[PDB]
A paper describes a structure:
In order to incorporate an additional electrostatic interaction across the D1-D1 interface, we used a Thr765 to Lys mutation to introduce a charged tether onto residues forming the opposing electronegative pocket (for additional rationale). Alone, this mutation had little functional effect, but coupled with the K759M mutation (K759M/T765K), current decay slowed several fold, and the additional mutation N768T (creating K759M/T765K/N768T, or MKT) yielded nondecaying current responses. In contrast, crystals of the [name] K759M/T765K [name] were successfully grown in the presence of zinc, and a dataset was collected from a single crystal at 2.9 Å resolution. Three protomers were present in the asymmetric unit, of which chains A and B formed a canonical dimer, and the third, C, formed a dimer with its symmetry-related counterpart. In each dimer (A:B and C:C′) electron density was visible for both the mutant Met and Lys residues, and the latter residue was spanning the dimer interface as predicted. Electrostatic interactions were formed between the amine group on residue 765 (i.e., T765K) and the sidechain carboxyl group of Asp511, as well as the backbone oxygen atom of Ile510. In addition to these contacts, there was a general shift in the dimer conformation, with the apical residues having moved closer together relative to structures of wild-type [name], forming a more extensive, contiguous interface. Consistent with functional recordings of [name] K759M/T765K, our structural data also suggest that the crossdimer tether does not persist indefinitely. Overall, these structural and functional data support the premise that the Lys tether is not a permanent feature of the T765K mutant series.
Residue numbers in the entry:
A (entry chain B): 393 to 408, 412 to 506, 555, 566, 632 to 677, 681 to 696, 700 to 773
B (entry chain A): 393 to 410, 412 to 453, 457 to 506, 555, 566, 632 to 674, 681 to 773
Write the structure that this text describes.
């Protein structure tokens, strides 16, 4: 039967189309990845953009998951192929593949902003900064016990958050610093109008994983699929294809 | 009931303490020792540490040996060691999210005129090899990359990493050792400080906590690994066993 694949519109992972029908509406890293995984695992699939346009978090009172994690937990989709960050709270409710891409939280600034590091952000007030409202980065700052980061969190929760990455980029370009993951950051660094740059090293190191509902029969297949693709050099080729082979700066 | 943890004597992951007077898991110190203790603490089980019988990591008479074998054939309940996550291993056992990153790298005696793998593949005066049962040797065996099929075609193997290191140190630069960057970088800061890593890594892969396929332990050890990483325990531990003990 057709596997329902949940995913999110996020460049260059999944991108737009009005005249097309199907998965063919979309292009990108996770699109090609979906196709390869499907090729090696031998199933048919339908790509579907996560309903609330979010990655996934749990509301602390209502205790319900949103975003792609929610659509996995509540049986609305059979698999998530996306820049979905492997985190503890998520592993608590769903299954993750071995990571298929490395990344870390990093700072994006408008070219010319006098910022060198996260500590620089934590020591000042003139430049605002925030993260994605539902997502692993915000959870990182919320739960962080590091002085600089607890300080930044203390600022942020009381101040700066955006609903989508595009809103964060737009907010930076029209200003404000944006805290976002290095992969998406570096991708935008090579995008017109070429007015943003990454500053400082990454704040942490984690990975993107393929996600299935906890206990799904697909976990092993998608997991040997990811490992196969990695060892065959397919993943490096895909990143090269969508990041650097299309750099506009 | 007691969980049997299979592991391998490999510095700084699992080592004999300065042990004859001791009994138990207390016989050992090292990265994977601390890691095991934390994993057990967060998963709430008791465990007995056991050194893999044939001292091997795992390869496939079609029978698995080493820690992979001891998992497949029910000799241990979990492997906590520098055991590399690979496709062929995933085919037969389960792996946690990786708790450490690493890549294949070249170890040479200080003064050897070698910069990269291509240089090794292009010459004959300096011999080179890998661990006999292990993921590196498999990497070269299965590599479809020209240089690496060339090196494999050439390839000199050792039974333990210590034999490879000793071979490097006693070969007067006529032998290079192909081994994982973590272990390389570790030996790099160890007396007699006569070895160095050359070139970048040949690949990028990981070490994982392993369980027999379908074990109820996979999930627990996997949330434990994710917690430990996120709480900074892993970075602290690597700092502890690698760099806080650097002799150069
Ligand atoms: N990849 C993140 C979303 C992006 C971000 O938070 O910066 C997640 O899985 O939650
Ligand atoms: N970590 C490797 C052994 C060391 C090596 O092959 O260099 C493995 O799990 O097979
Ligand atoms: Zn449209
Ligand atoms: Zn393929
Ligand atoms: Zn001893
Ligand atoms: Zn602890």
């Amino acid at each position: 039967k057709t596997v329902v694949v949940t995913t999110i519109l996020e460049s260059p992972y999944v991108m737009m189309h009005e005249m097309l029908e199907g998965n063919e509406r979309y292009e990108g890293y996770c699109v090609d990845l979906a196709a390869e995984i499907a090729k090696h695992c031998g199933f048919k699939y339908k790509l579907t953009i996560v309903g609330d346009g979010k990655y996934g978090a749990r509301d602390a009172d209502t205790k319900i998951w949103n975003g792609m994690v929610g659509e996995l937990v509540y049986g609305k989709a059979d698999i998530a192929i996306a820049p979905l960050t492997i985190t503890l709270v998520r592993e608590e409710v769903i299954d993750f593949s071995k990571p298929f891409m490395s990344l870390g939280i990093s700072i994006m600034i408008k070219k010319g902003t006098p910022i060198e590091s996260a500590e620089d952000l934590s020591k000042q007030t003139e430049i605002a900064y925030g993260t994605l409202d539902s997502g692993s980065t915000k959870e990182f700052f919320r739960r962080s016990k590091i002085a600089v980061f607890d300080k930044m969190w203390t600022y942020m929760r009381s101040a700066v958050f955006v609903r989508t990455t595009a809103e964060g980029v737009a907010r930076v370009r029209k200003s404000y610093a944006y805290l976002l993951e290095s992969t998406m950051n570096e991708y935008i660094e090579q995008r017109k109008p070429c007015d943003t740059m990454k500053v400082g090293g990454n704040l942490d190191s984690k990975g993107y994983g393929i996600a299935t509902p906890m206990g799904s029969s697909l976990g092993k297949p998608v997991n040997l699929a990811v490992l196969k693709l990695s060892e065959q050099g397919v993943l490096d080729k895909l990143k090269n294809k969508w990041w650097y082979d299309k750099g506009e700066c």
